[PDB]
Design a protein around this ligand. Structure first.
Ligand SMILES: [Zn+2]
Ligand SMILES: [Zn+2]
Ligand SMILES: [Zn+2]
Length: 736
């Protein structure tokens, strides 16, 4: 009676066969025939899983060999000018994604506030035309497996245009795509399509508010030209903006996110503005991995049902954003695993919620709730942590007074040189310990640390780092030793192209129990008489890169992690480490979509940082690394962190990134990333980068260092770049 659906499914496959397949093709190890056969096997496999879960409308079209936006580019003839000569085939497809020997790749940007990156369209004089029948082929293919349950999906024109680059005139660009979409949809209906999911997440965002009338024109058009289609104006990631206006779109159904846009959408329907329309209700978390709260969700569905003409139940976004399945996670505690749900498990949940709304009895439903309740009641979610009322949130002495005390203890030269902490890893082959004694691995890493310690000494870098050779992930390396964290055996998620990450799971209260990084850091320091830095990851990054608990508020979690970082920082200081660097490279990525919610997030972020760093002695020097760009946004927050030194990337802007610190008269220490760690710098090239920020703020305030970590670069080029860095700095010193 009540339909269930889904927006999308991962491409990976249970053991990353998709990743191995496309990567093998690029390496010339897999023919075209085996590429497409392999990709077909996967699709059919995925269609069956979704069929067997009981879905009434199974998403078809989101499967891709790299990216769903890129798919539209090639399909709509939006191909970068530099590739305009190539034949339009899969090699050109991958050429745009990865670049060939003559042309660089298209750029990629973040898919909203997710961990996924899409490939950015590059508009030019090119006339939009259909270059294939990609979506029709996929649809007809699916029909043979699932039949009338097949639901074509596609990113809408407005969102596609907004995510693009080079668009001179927005409505003209959008308008030129309409006839293509018309043909696409008309072919699908002819082939038997009914419901067609048309994604417009842009209408959950601030920017979206500029396009309300474009939405009216575009969908009035589709409704006039393809009258037989049942369109699903599909949004996700936040609430529907201007819901009272958009609710008037001439479309059959609306896809609302009741997980990340609960309150806004909830009040959008209580108005009775969707009583004449069908709601596709995003009620299962598509970006996280906890089993649903069935009581909560069922009661929610009842309210939605009475406020709509028809209800269809689905996850809040494409399952693209979660791992495939918990079935093979055999190392997990049963009380935890029975409280987890990845992609496949969510298909089952969505089915069971509908059957319970239709008043069908199923033992699985109450059993699900029982397993849900056990997890909540577990000891690990009831850990007694340090009392926050007995924990400092503000350092005893302010910046100015600390700057003196520290200078008296460190006597670092004007414009000290240093690095963001990490050095190139060669060996990964050694780590496979595979089986090798621990006293061998340690001795191995320690030999490598000494080596680089001498290197930095010769280069005359006055603040050293151990290299982090023992670290493969800046988050999981901590998650491995913090209680309340666990890793998975197979929880992979696509981040961009053939890259995937396997994020930790914060399943319980977070608690520091043992030294995490102290050993390596203390060793390095014993070798030299120059200051060695400790490197840690702040709570923001740790949360954003992990699958976080959803049963406790963001700020509470932040504080828990802050406490652990505090306890680890204590250990470091105890051991004699005098400079400690807290890295936050996810602050941007974790920023809420809506401008109206960013301040509360930043406040949570700043407080937790204070929890982490306010219990150090005045002499101990607190550094924070932030690989961001638009600092003007978070400037107040940054100044709020009260870091002795904050290092940025000024190389890309040639040094003009200081503008925000200039306006805000930043009185704290600033590290200058004067070399892109992604791309050999010239000596005259680096000095200019250094002197730029010297315009307003005083020189006694700056540090010279690379843009970010060096794990990306090769040792040869790394050493050469550092030589130039130190030379450029020394030079600007002589000129006083
Ligand atoms: Zn990423
Ligand atoms: Zn009930
Ligand atoms: Zn505070």
């Amino acid at each position: 009676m009540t339909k269930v659906s889904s927006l999308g499914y991962p491409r990976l496959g249970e053991n990353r066969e998709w990743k191995k397949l496309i990567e093998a093709y690029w390496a010339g190890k897999v023919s075209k025939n085996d590429l497409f056969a392999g990709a077909k096997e996967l699709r059919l496999d995925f269609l069956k899983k979704q069929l067997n879960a009981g879905l009434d409308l199974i998403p078809v079209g989101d499967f891709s060999l790299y990216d769903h936006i890129l798919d539209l580019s090639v399909q709509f003839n939006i191909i970068p000018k530099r590739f305009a000569k190539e034949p339009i085939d899969i090699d050109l497809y991958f050429a745009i994604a990865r670049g060939n020997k003559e042309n660089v790749a298209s750029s990629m940007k973040k898919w909203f506030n997710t961990n996924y990156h899409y490939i950015v369209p590059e508009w030019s004089k090119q006339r939009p035309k259909l270059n294939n029948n990609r979506l029709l082929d996929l649809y007809l293919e699916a029909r043979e497996v699932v039949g009338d349950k097949a639901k074509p999906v596609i990113t809408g024109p407005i969102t596609y245009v907004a995510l693009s680059t080079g668009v001179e005139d927005f409505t003209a660009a959008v308008k030129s795509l309409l006839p293509l979409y018309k043909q696409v949809f008309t072919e699908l209906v002819k082939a038997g399509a009914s419901y067609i999911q048309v994604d417009e997440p842009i209408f959950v965002t601030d920017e979206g508010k500029d396009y309300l009338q474009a939405a009216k024109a575009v969908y009035a058009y589709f409704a006039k030209e393809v009258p037989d289609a049942k369109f699903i104006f599909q949004t996700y990631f936040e609430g529907l903006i201007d819901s009272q206006v958009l609710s008037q779109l001439p479309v059959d159904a609306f896809g609302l996110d009741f997980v990340y846009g609960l309150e806004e959408n909830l009040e959008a329907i209580k108005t009775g503005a969707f009583k004449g329309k069908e709601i596709f209700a995003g009620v299962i978390d598509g970006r996280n991995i906890w089993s649903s709260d069935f009581v909560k969700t069922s009661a929610l569905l009842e309210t939605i049902e009475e406020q709509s003409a028809a209800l269809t139940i689905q996850p809040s976004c494409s399952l693209l954003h979660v791992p495939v399945t918990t079935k093979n996670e055999t190392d997990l505690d049963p009380v935890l695993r029975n409280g987890l749900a990845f992609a496949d498990e969510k298909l089952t949940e969505v089915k069971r919620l509908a059957e319970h709304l239709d008043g069908r009895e199923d033992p699985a439903y109450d059993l699900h709730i029982a397993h849900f309740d056990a997890l909540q009641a577990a000891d690990f979610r009831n850990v007694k942590l340090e009392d926050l009322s007995r924990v400092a949130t503000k350092r005893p002495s302010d910046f100015a007074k600390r700057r003196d005390i520290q200078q008296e203890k460190l006597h670092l030269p004007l414009l000290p040189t240093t690095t963001i902490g990490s050095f190139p890893q060669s060996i990964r082959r050694t780590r496979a310990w595979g089986d090798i004694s621990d006293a061998e691995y340690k001795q191995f890493i320690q030999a490598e640390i000494e080596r680089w310690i001498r290197i930095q000494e010769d280069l005359d870098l006055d603040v050293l780092v151990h290299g982090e050779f023992e670290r493969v992930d800046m988050v999981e390396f901590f998650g491995q030793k913090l209680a309340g964290f666990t890793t998975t055996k197979f929880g992979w998620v696509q981040s961009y192209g053939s890259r995937a990450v396997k994020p930790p799971i914060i399943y319980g209260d977070v608690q520091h129990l043992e030294p995490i990084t102290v050993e390596e850091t203390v060793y390095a320091q014993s070798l030299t008489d120059r200051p060695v830095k400790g490197m840690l990851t702040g709570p923001i990054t740790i949360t954003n890169w992990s699958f976080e608990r959803t049963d406790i508020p963001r700020d509470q979690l932040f504080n828990q992690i802050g406490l652990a970082i505090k306890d680890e920082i204590k250990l470091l200081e105890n051991a004699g480490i005098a400079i400690i660097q807290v890295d936050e490279a996810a602050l941007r990525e974790g920023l809420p979509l809506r401008k109206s919610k960013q301040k509360a997030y930043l406040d949570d972020a700043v407080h937790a940082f204070h929890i982490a760093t306010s219990s150090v002695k005045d002499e101990t020097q607190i550094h924070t690394h932030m690989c961001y760009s638009k600092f003007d946004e978070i400037i107040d927050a940054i100044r709020a962190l009260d870091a002795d030194v904050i290092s940025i990337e000024t190389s890309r802007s040639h040094g003009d990134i200081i503008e925000s610190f200039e306006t805000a008269v930043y009185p704290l220490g600033i590290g200058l990333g004067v070399y892109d760690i992604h791309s050999v710098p010239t000596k005259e090239e680096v000095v200019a980068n250094i002197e730029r920020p010297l315009r307003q703020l005083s020189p006694t305030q700056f540090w010279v260092n690379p843009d970010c970590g060096l794990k990306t670069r090769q040792e040869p080029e790394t050493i050469a770049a550092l030589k130039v860095l130190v030379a450029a700095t020394k030079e600007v010193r002589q000129k006083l």
